[PDB]
Amino acid sequence: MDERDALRISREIAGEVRKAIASMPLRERVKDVGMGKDGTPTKAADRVAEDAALEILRKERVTVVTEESGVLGEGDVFVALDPLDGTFNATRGIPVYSVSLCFSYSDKLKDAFFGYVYNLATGDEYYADSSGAYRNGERIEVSDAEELYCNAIIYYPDRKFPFKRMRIFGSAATELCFFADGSFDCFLDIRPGKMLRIYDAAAGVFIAEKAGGKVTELDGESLGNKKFDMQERLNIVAANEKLHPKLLELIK
Amino acid sequence: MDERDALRISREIAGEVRKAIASMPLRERVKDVGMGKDGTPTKAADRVAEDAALEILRKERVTVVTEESGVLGEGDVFVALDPLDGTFNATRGIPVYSVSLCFSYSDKLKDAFFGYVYNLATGDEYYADSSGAYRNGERIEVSDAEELYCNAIIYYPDRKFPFKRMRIFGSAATELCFFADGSFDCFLDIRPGKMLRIYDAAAGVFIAEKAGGKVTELDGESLGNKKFDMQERLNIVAANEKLHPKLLELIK
Numbered sequence: 001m002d003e004r005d006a007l008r009i010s011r012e013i014a015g016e017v018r019k020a021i022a023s024m025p026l027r028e029r030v031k032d033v034g035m036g037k038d039g040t041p042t043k044a045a046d047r048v049a050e051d052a053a054l055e056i057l058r059k060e061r062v063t064v065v066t067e068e069s070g071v072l073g074e075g076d077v078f079v080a081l082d083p084l085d086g087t088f089n090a091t092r093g094i095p096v097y098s099v100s101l102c103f104s105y106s107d108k109l110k111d112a113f114f115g116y117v118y119n120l121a122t123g124d125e126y127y128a129d130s131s132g133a134y135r136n137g138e139r140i141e142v143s144d145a146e147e148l149y150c151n152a153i154i155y156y157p158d159r160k161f162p163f164k165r166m167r168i169f170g171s172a173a174t175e176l177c178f179f180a181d182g183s184f185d186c187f188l189d190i191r192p193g194k195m196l197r198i199y200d201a202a203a204g205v206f207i208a209e210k211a212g213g214k215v216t217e218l219d220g221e222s223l224g225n226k227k228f229d230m231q232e233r234l235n236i237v238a239a240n241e242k243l244h245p246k247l248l249e250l251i252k
Numbered sequence: 253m254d255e256r257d258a259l260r261i262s263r264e265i266a267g268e269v270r271k272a273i274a275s276m277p278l279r280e281r282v283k284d285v286g287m288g289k290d291g292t293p294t295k296a297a298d299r300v301a302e303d304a305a306l307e308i309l310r311k312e313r314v315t316v317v318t319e320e321s322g323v324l325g326e327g328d329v330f331v332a333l334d335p336l337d338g339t340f341n342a343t344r345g346i347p348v349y350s351v352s353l354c355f356s357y358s359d360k361l362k363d364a365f366f367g368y369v370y371n372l373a374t375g376d377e378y379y380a381d382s383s384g385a386y387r388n389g390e391r392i393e394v395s396d397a398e399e400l401y402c403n404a405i406i407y408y409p410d411r412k413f414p415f416k417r418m419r420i421f422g423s424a425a426t427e428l429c430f431f432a433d434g435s436f437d438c439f440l441d442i443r444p445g446k447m448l449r450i451y452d453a454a455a456g457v458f459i460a461e462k463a464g465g466k467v468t469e470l471d472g473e474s475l476g477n478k479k480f481d482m483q484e485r486l487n488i489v490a491a492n493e494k495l496h497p498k499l500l501e502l503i504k
């Protein structure tokens with residue numbers, strides 16, 4: 001498989017998932033219908049989304065790490081799937097929620113070769129390969145803000161900060177992308193628990209990196225070794241090169 | 253005038269504005285074109301929105317209190333207008349932003365008789381008259397959450413809280429209606445400055461009360477006396493009847 005197949009697969013799925021959620025009225029979407037292998041409830045929207053997604057994926061030589069169904073397949077290419085990121089929003093008609101894939105040549109992020117995030121409410125399409133970062137076909141890159149007084153997406157602010165704006169949209173895959181097209185200046189998830197899971201971040205981090213951003217663990221460490229398993233967890237500090245270190249301090 | 257008129261006017265404006273913004277490309281929307289009588293920059297997006305709206309309201313027997321142009325007219329009915337709430341989002345193509353009208357029979361919120369908030373990205377229409385609260389024509393009400401571990405929209409978190417979720421979407425008018433229809437459990441702007449301005453909250457507060465919400469100031473105090481002027485600034489604590497008082501202490 002190559003980063004063009006990925007684009008094709010990814011787009012095919014975005015079609016099917018988008019179609020799946022569009023039909024389902026809100027009262028249907030919001031129904032807990034399962035326990036997800038993740039250990040959080042599978043809403044009905046999660047189920048129809050992942051079923052559609054998985055159906056296209058099962059045909060490829062891949063191991064899929066997805067939120068509702070766990071780890072599936074045995075192929076050498078690993079795919080980290082959040083078949084609906086921002087499920088909460090989606091069950092309430094709030095239009096920030098996405099399907100998110102990240103393809104890796106191994107079970108570690110450092111061997112990623114494609115990131116895809118598709119806003120299922122708007123149709124905005126984010127992805128990245130060796131050629132760079134795109135939004136709706138158009139090359140993108142991060143902001144150059146240098147002052148802590150910037151536009152921050154942050155999970156969760158636990159004290160007085162210096163930022164110009166703070167926002168939290170409830171779709172990390174999409175919010176990594178908002179950072180990656182310079183809509184926002186940084187992206188932090190500093191929640192002490194380490195809540196983010198491989199399928200939540202993987203595509204966003206990749207796409208953001210390709211768009212110039214510097215994206216690290218809390219302590220400043222690289223994300224390269226983060227694993228594609230159900231068990232992996234993440235904190236993120238993402239910001240262009242100048243801003244990042246200052247944030248790294250502010251967090252201390 | 254009458255609520256039915258208010259409804260007709262409000263709709264006319266949502267049409268003209270929704271249209272003005274949709275034609276205007278992002279790179280145009282995001283340009284600072286003035287200082288607003290409110291004391292923040294007017295963007296091109298704020299201006300084409302406000303102009304569109306004001307073209308319609310000029311023909312009515314009203315005093316308008318808007319964000320970019322200040323206080324205009326002599327008429328006995330006051331109209332708190334945010335001609336575009338969530339400007340930041342609108343300039344980045346993030347789908348939460350809207351136009352927000354609130355009509356009152358005096359310069360005081362207690363004398364309000366219509367609230368309107370129309371999501372300009374999605375076309376969701378929120379409003380409320382003597383009859384009650386509506387989203388897209390259908391009656392709405394708040395949630396019955398009784399537990400602090402709830403879905404909170406909150407500007408801004410300054411410490412560890414106990415909520416199930418926190419979100420900040422950057423359109424107070426729309427976020428108030430998210431609470432109004434039960435999508436979130438509560439709305440808090442506890443920002444020490446008291447940052448909010450009349451045309452940001454008025455429609456949202458109204459629409460929330462008519463949908464069941466208890467909506468007070470930081471200290472439980474009533475909002476009825478909040479004036480329709482540019483000086484007026486607000487904190488909000490909104491939550492259903494049971495939940496509300498629990499929150500009022502939580503923030504001491």
Ligand SMILES: N[C@@H](CCC(=O)O)C(=O)O
Binds near residue numbers: 012014015125
């Ligand atoms: N495959 C989706 C959209 C994805 C895309 O065009 O990138 C569709 O045709 O509806």
Ligand SMILES: N[C@@H](CCC(=O)O)C(=O)O
Binds near residue numbers: 030088416
């Ligand atoms: N009432 C909300 C609580 C949050 C949750 O269960 O996810 C819901 O059904 O979603």
Ligand SMILES: N[C@@H](CCC(=O)O)C(=O)O
Binds near residue numbers: 264267
């Ligand atoms: N002119 C507005 C009002 C809403 C309605 O007529 O239903 C619109 O349709 O976008």
Ligand SMILES: N[C@@H](CCC(=O)O)C(=O)O
Binds near residue numbers: 151164282340
């Ligand atoms: N052009 C502005 C957008 C809004 C603002 O921050 O005032 C910026 O650099 O952020």
Ligand SMILES: [Mg+2]
Binds near residue numbers: 067
């Ligand atoms: Mg999911």
Ligand SMILES: [Mg+2]
Binds near residue numbers: 082
């Ligand atoms: Mg998720």
Ligand SMILES: [Mg+2]
Binds near residue numbers: 298320334335339
């Ligand atoms: Mg405005």
Ligand SMILES: [Mg+2]
Binds near residue numbers: 319335
């Ligand atoms: Mg505004």
